[PDB]
Amino acid sequence: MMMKISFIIATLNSGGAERVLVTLANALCKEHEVSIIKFHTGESFYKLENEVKVTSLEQFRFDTLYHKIASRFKKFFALRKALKESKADVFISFLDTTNIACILANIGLKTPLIISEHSNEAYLKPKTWRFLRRVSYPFCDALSVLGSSDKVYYERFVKRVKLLLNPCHFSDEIPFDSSFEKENLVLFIGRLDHNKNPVMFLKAIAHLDKNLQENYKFVIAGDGELRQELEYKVKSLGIKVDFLGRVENVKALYEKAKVLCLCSFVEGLPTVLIESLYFEVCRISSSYYNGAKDLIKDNHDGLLVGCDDEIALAKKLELVLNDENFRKELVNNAKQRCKDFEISNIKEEWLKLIVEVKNA
Ligand SMILES: CC(=O)N[C@H]1[C@@H](OP(=O)(O)OP(=O)(O)OC[C@H]2O[C@@H](n3ccc(=O)[nH]c3=O)[C@H](O)[C@@H]2O)O[C@H](CO)[C@H](O)[C@@H]1O
Ligand SMILES: [Cl-]
Ligand SMILES: [Cl-]
Ligand SMILES: [K+]
Ligand code: NA
Ligand code: NA
């Protein structure tokens, strides 16, 4: 039997949740009828298959006080309309604020709703949103989480919670026996905000051996609020870092790069620590709040440092850059994890969850 699956997401931007949704939609869209409802107009940053149907809600004004109030109500009822008129067998929403909007908008309708979390629960800070999450999430039909820790957190007040790892689209594009001729290249890939902490990357570079700073390229791929302030820090520290902005061909960076650094305080299941597995990129990561050891076995397939510890990051960087055989050992061991994120097995566990929710 074919199922009509409608995803709901705020935008189809470059974020990691969007990357996961597009991979899921593309995998499901040939056997099943897949549609996406998004709150804002625009073309998908990630390439979406032609069978996936995309609709955007109507856009509204938010410039005057009247419109700042009336358009919030119009936006909610535009979503309720799109759900009413949808002939989906199941709704699947992405990201907490969107999950909450879908739970409220779906009140009284009968299509079941699966909500999907794409961060650690601790990432949501304001007490009012944590309250709304606490009171609305019990009314979903199922919740997908990214780690066992968030599973136990949510399971306390949500009936059906399932741990679903994210599929990586590189698992179907890069052959497992690929060889790479690496350059003296170090990457930071991610949004430039406080949580991602790119300043830790810059400070670590300034502490590297002269010998390394002059013979290595350090690349920041991504954009965000902190872009301008980071370029000043680069000047003030007297280092050479190349800001590429937001790049569409991250594959070319991964192919040439020896090392990637993640400096976040809080992550769900960081995509760059998965994508690196398929290109023999050595992973150095802060011990972001809670899931880091689920992706890196320290000194076996990668290296962990304390949060906000730019000195430790520099030493770990020097440890693999001054010892290529040790770096090669880490990335060889990391290859055993490539099978954990194949699209095929994760797609079927989503289909199992959809069937379990449709049969209740
Ligand atoms: C703070 C947080 O919880 N973030 C979570 C959120 O991911 P994020 O929203 O924080 O983004 P991410 O870092 O996990 O991935 C961003 C993605 O876009 C990429 N990219 C980046 C720069 C660029 O120039 N070009 C480009 O394509 C990239 O290679 C990638 O797949 O959702 C993910 C999937 O659930 C993970 O759970 C993340 O941990
Ligand atoms: Cl992003
Ligand atoms: Cl007004
Ligand atoms: K970005
Ligand atoms: Na995201
Ligand atoms: Na990431």
TrEMBL record:
Binding site for UDP-N-acetyl-alpha-D-galactosamine: G16, Y46, H118, N166, R191, K196, V247, E267, G268, L269, T271, E275
One Pfam family per UniProt: Glyco_transf_4
Keyword entries, A-Z: Nucleotide-binding
Source organism: Campylobacter jejuni
Chain positions recorded as UDP binding sites: G16, R191, K196, V247, T271, V272, E275
GO MF annotations, alphabetized: glycosyltransferase activity; nucleotide binding
Protein name as it appears in the record: WlaC protein
This protein's encoding gene: wlaC
Annotated PANTHER family: GLYCOSYLTRANSFERASE
Keyword check for Nucleotide-binding: yes
Gene3D superfamilies: Glycogen Phosphorylase B
InterPro entries: Glyco_trans_1 (IPR001296), Glyco_trans_4-like_N (IPR028098)
Cell membrane as UniProt keyword: no
Glycosyltransferase subfamily 4-like N-terminal domain span: 15-145
